[PDB]
Design an enzyme around this catalytic site. Structure first.
Site, PDB file in Angstrom:
ATOM      1  N   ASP A  47      34.226  20.113 -27.936  1.00 32.00           N
ATOM      2  CA  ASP A  47      35.221  20.866 -27.202  1.00 32.00           C
ATOM      3  C   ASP A  47      36.478  20.983 -28.063  1.00 32.00           C
ATOM      4  OD1 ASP A  47      36.135  22.028 -24.422  1.00 32.00           O
ATOM      5  OD2 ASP A  47      37.723  20.669 -25.135  1.00 32.00           O
ATOM      6  N   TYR A  52      45.137  22.782 -30.496  1.00 28.08           N
ATOM      7  CA  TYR A  52      45.024  21.405 -30.902  1.00 28.08           C
ATOM      8  C   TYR A  52      45.313  21.243 -32.407  1.00 28.08           C
ATOM      9  CZ  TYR A  52      42.531  20.832 -26.393  1.00 28.08           C
ATOM     10  OH  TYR A  52      42.180  20.849 -25.075  1.00 28.08           O
ATOM     11  N   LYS A  81      39.343  27.631 -26.817  1.00 19.23           N
ATOM     12  CA  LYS A  81      40.218  28.055 -25.741  1.00 19.23           C
ATOM     13  C   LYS A  81      41.290  29.013 -26.261  1.00 19.23           C
ATOM     14  CE  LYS A  81      39.612  23.451 -23.726  1.00 19.23           C
ATOM     15  NZ  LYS A  81      39.541  22.659 -24.970  1.00 19.23           N
ATOM     16  N   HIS A 114      43.088  28.939 -21.465  1.00 23.72           N
ATOM     17  CA  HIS A 114      43.504  27.531 -21.566  1.00 23.72           C
ATOM     18  C   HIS A 114      44.336  27.106 -20.341  1.00 23.72           C
ATOM     19  CE1 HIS A 114      44.307  24.321 -24.873  1.00 23.72           C
ATOM     20  NE2 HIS A 114      44.242  23.738 -23.660  1.00 23.72           N
ATOM     21  N   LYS A 256      37.487  12.098 -25.390  1.00 18.82           N
ATOM     22  CA  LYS A 256      38.080  12.232 -26.704  1.00 18.82           C
ATOM     23  C   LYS A 256      38.157  10.844 -27.342  1.00 18.82           C
ATOM     24  CE  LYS A 256      42.010  11.761 -29.398  1.00 18.82           C
ATOM     25  NZ  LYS A 256      42.831  10.536 -29.606  1.00 18.82           N
ATOM     26  N   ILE A 263      33.048   6.428 -29.819  1.00 25.69           N
ATOM     27  CA  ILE A 263      32.284   7.695 -29.670  1.00 25.69           C
ATOM     28  C   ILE A 263      30.835   7.365 -29.264  1.00 25.69           C
ATOM     29  CG2 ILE A 263      31.334   9.639 -31.003  1.00 25.69           C
ATOM     30  CD1 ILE A 263      34.051   9.653 -32.528  1.00 25.69           C
ATOM     31  N   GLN A 265      29.670   4.539 -27.800  1.00 25.14           N
ATOM     32  CA  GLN A 265      29.623   3.917 -26.472  1.00 25.14           C
ATOM     33  C   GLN A 265      29.743   4.990 -25.375  1.00 25.14           C
ATOM     34  OE1 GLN A 265      32.408   0.645 -26.245  1.00 25.14           O
ATOM     35  NE2 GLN A 265      31.295  -0.562 -27.761  1.00 25.14           N
TER      36      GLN A 265
HETATM   37  C1  LIG Z   1      42.621  19.068 -22.082  1.00 24.86           C
HETATM   38 AS1  LIG Z   1      44.106  20.297 -22.006  1.00 24.86          AS
HETATM   39  C2  LIG Z   1      45.762  19.483 -21.338  1.00 24.86           C
HETATM   40  O1  LIG Z   1      44.239  20.929 -23.617  1.00 24.86           O
HETATM   41  O2  LIG Z   1      43.693  21.636 -20.954  1.00 24.86           O
END
Ligand SMILES: C[As](C)(=O)[O-]
Length: 314
Positions: A47, A52, A81, A114, A256, A263, A265
């Site tokens: 994802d 990001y 997104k 988003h 995350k 990761i 587990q």
């Molecule tokens: C997981 As988010 C705050 O980037 O929608």
């Protein structure tokens, strides 16, 4: 054609793996190794998002995995997104093409709006001068073009309330496939869950461990006595119990991490279950939304209150 186990079926007929690697707040310096280790460990779902600031590093890891023969492209489910400043119809394809360039892909499995919030192209969302009223039907029609062209095999939204999701579903030619939302034992989203089940929209859970950066009272939901208790009974970690809860609700989860051991587990949520009697006890956990959308709730916003942003779901 993917198997039944460890997937949910989208309204498109595509299968989404029920565990994916979250990359929100994953540092660009370490996300590559996280993605590589995740897929090596058996993750088949990553994802991502433009916002990001790490999709190029994700892209390098995907390239490595493909060139090494660990997986083929068709084996992975990749999501990205659309950020708030690219909601205009001509800007939607520009954003997707930039994302595909960074991830080094020809298509996405899923592309999400988003937030239900819009800003001027190239502006800073921290400034009210940047704000524009959303036009979700317009933006969605642009998303439908990407669906029709196969550039995104499914389209959906993120951070839409049941009301906003329903309003889009009523207006859309192509129904949203996914609503990706905060969902964990401290914020169980039962209203949206029920709405999604009733309309055939997939609920995908971000922050499925609450807020690990926090104290117990501030959102570290894994410190809930009920979760600790169940973890001890079943010989699993609190994180594993939280994730399994979500799995048993029929959600996908997007834990995350950039730690290889964590990761690994976080994928161990399939070969065991939470008994029905223990599952019922999750109803006793105090409900508090941890990602409240403060950055878009203020006197200058289309959302003057949290109740407006979330249509009462807070
Ligand atoms: C997981 As988010 C705050 O980037 O929608």
């Amino acid at each position: 054609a993917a198997p039944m186990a460890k997937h949910l079926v989208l309204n498109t007929g595509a299968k989404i793996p029920s565990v994916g690697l979250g990359t929100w707040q994953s540092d660009p310096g370490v996300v590559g190794n996280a993605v590589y280790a995740a897929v090596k460990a058996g993750y088949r779902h990553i994802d991502c998002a433009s916002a990001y600031n790490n999709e190029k590093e994700v892209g390098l890891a995907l390239k490595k995995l493909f060139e090494e023969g660990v997986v083929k492209r068709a084996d992975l489910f990749i999501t990205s997104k659309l950020w708030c400043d690219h909601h205009a119809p001509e800007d939607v394809p520009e954003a997707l093409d930039a994302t595909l360039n960074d991830l080094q892909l020809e298509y996405l499995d899923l592309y999400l709006i988003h937030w239900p919030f819009r800003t001027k192209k190239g502006s800073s969302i921290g400034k009210p001068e940047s704000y524009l009223p959303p036009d979700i039907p317009s933006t969605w029609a642009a998303m439908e073009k990407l669906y029709d062209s196969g550039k995104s095999r499914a389209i959906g939204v993120s951070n839409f309330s049941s009301k906003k999701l329903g309003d889009l579903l009523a207006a859309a030619r192509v129904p949203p496939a996914v609503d990706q939302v905060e969902c964990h034992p401290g914020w169980q989203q039962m209203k949206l869950h029920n709405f999604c089940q009733s309309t055939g929209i997939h609920l995908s859970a971000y922050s499925p461990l609450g807020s690990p950066g926090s104290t117990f009272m501030n959102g570290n939901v894994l410190k809930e006595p009920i979760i600790i208790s169940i973890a001890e009974k079943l010989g699993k970690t609190p994180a594993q119990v939280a994730l399994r809860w979500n799995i048993q609700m029929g959600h996908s989860v997007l834990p995350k991490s950039v730690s290889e051991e964590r990761i690994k587990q976080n994928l161990d949520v399939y070969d065991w279950s939470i008994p029905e009697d223990l599952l019922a006890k999750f109803s006793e956990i105090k409900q508090v939304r941890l990602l409240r959308g403060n950055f878009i709730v203020n006197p200058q916003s289309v959302y003057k209150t949290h109740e407006e942003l979330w249509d009462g779901e807070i």
